Swiss-Prot record, chain B:
This is Nuclear receptor subfamily 1 group I member 2. One of its GO terms (molecular function) is zinc ion binding. Heterodimer with RXR. Interacts with NCOA1. Interacts (via domain NR LBD) with CRY1 and CRY2 in a ligand-dependent manner. One of its GO terms (biological process) is intestinal epithelial structure maintenance. Expressed in liver, colon and small intestine. The keyword Zinc-finger applies. It comes from Homo sapiens (Human). Hyperforin binds at S91, Q129, L130, R131, F132, H251. The lineage of its organism: Eukaryota, Metazoa, Chordata, Craniata, Vertebrata. Its main location: nucleus.
């Protein structure tokens, strides 16, 4: 599961459970894009320990798509997949 | 060189090769430049921190087109910043590599997770700097980073001016040593495990590891380096590492000052610091 702990119309706070397949993971890539897009996707990355992320500058009233990718130091694994995804609206 | 030492070096070598992209082939999508209060006098200090850095940037095409960027002279402006967004992306890309490199090592994975976090946060800039050095060209005064290159401006100024900044001096001095890849990799290991670093419960375990690596570095040089010249060399490298830790502290202060008037930092950088 991926959760939004809090929202404001601009801004998001989001959480995920730790895996499971860590160590596995060097970092989490995070992508948020407008939910089906004109928008270019935005991705940023955080350390494997981090359970929490902030997304900012969002438009009000817009449905959104948020994707988390967990990134594996070469030949872990734990395979592979999934990216885990959610949609939220201003 | 004990079978264990040889094994230790082998593991480090593997991690770097997986860990580290010398090409910077996979470095993509970076930002590019051009693309009354008081606080201020914070600004005058901030300008000083920026001033030391400043570099030309060159991009090489798949075409073999070259793009050259020359940074503005200071002004007020907020000109000074312009590189900063690009720099953060490069640091962020480097950091991801650094984190993997730690992850690969068996000893690091073994460590209690809180300890990993403390070490990585302490380590990360120093390791990143060490990786940069391998790219660095003293004669050029350039870091060559695949298609990307960064070239130092000449203040003229001088070398005498240039050497004033600790980071620049360190790269030139480290480059002089002409280290083997094993030597560079060991340094990262010694840096990566520091007992000192803030937030570390498990001092005793780390210190042994750091010592064990240090001996391996000491052993390697004596066996592999033909001795008579090189008797010093281990001492100098250790000296460089000590210098690095101090430089790391200086950098950390600088970033905080820059951010506070200006924020560039990526989420990973904030997470890491």
């Amino acid at each position: 599961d991926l959760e939004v702990v809090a929202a404001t119309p601009t801004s998001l706070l989001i959480s995920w459970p730790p895996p499971y397949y860590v160590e596995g993971v060097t970092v989490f890539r995070i992508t948020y894009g407008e939910t089906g897009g004109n928008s270019p996707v935005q991705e940023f990355t955080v350390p494997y320990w981090t359970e929490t992320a902030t997304i900012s500058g969002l438009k009000p009233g817009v449905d959104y798509t948020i994707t988390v990718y967990a990134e594996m130091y070469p030949g872990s694994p734990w395979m592979d997949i999934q990216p885990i995804s959610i949609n939220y609206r201003t | 060189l004990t079978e264990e030492q040889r094994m230790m070096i082998r593991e480090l070598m593997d991690a770097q090769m997986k860990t580290f992209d010398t090409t910077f082939s996979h470095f993509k999508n970076f930002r590019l430049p051009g693309v009354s209060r008081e606080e201020a006098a914070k600004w005058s200090q901030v300008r000083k921190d920026l001033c030391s850095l400043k570099v030309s940037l060159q991009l090489r095409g798949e075409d073999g087109s070259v793009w050259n960027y020359k940074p503005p002279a200071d002004s007020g402006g907020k000109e000074i910043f312009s590189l900063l967004p690009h720099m953060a992306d490069m640091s962020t890309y480097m950091f991801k590599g650094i984190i993997s490199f730690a992850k690969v090592i068996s000893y690091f994975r073994d460590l209690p997770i809180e300890d990993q976090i403390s070490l990585l946060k302490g380590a990360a800039f120093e390791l990143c700097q060490l990786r940069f050095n391998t790219v660095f060209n003293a004669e050029t005064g350039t870091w060559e980073c695949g298609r990307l290159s960064y070239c130092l401006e000449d203040t003229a100024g001088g070398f005498q001016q240039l050497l004033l900044e600790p980071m620049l001096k360190f790269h030139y001095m480290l480059k002089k040593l002409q280290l083997h890849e094993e030597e560079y990799v060991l340094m990262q290991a010694i840096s990566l495990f520091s007992p000192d670093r803030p937030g570390v419960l498990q001092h005793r375990v780390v210190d042994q590891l750091q010592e064990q690596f240090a001996i391996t570095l000491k052993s390697y040089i004596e066996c592999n380096r033909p001795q008579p010249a090189h008797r010093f060399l281990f001492l100098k490298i250790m000296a460089m590492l000590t210098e690095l830790r101090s430089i790391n502290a200086q950098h950390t202060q600088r970033l905080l000052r820059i951010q506070d008037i200006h924020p560039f930092a990526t989420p990973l950088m904030q997470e890491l610091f």
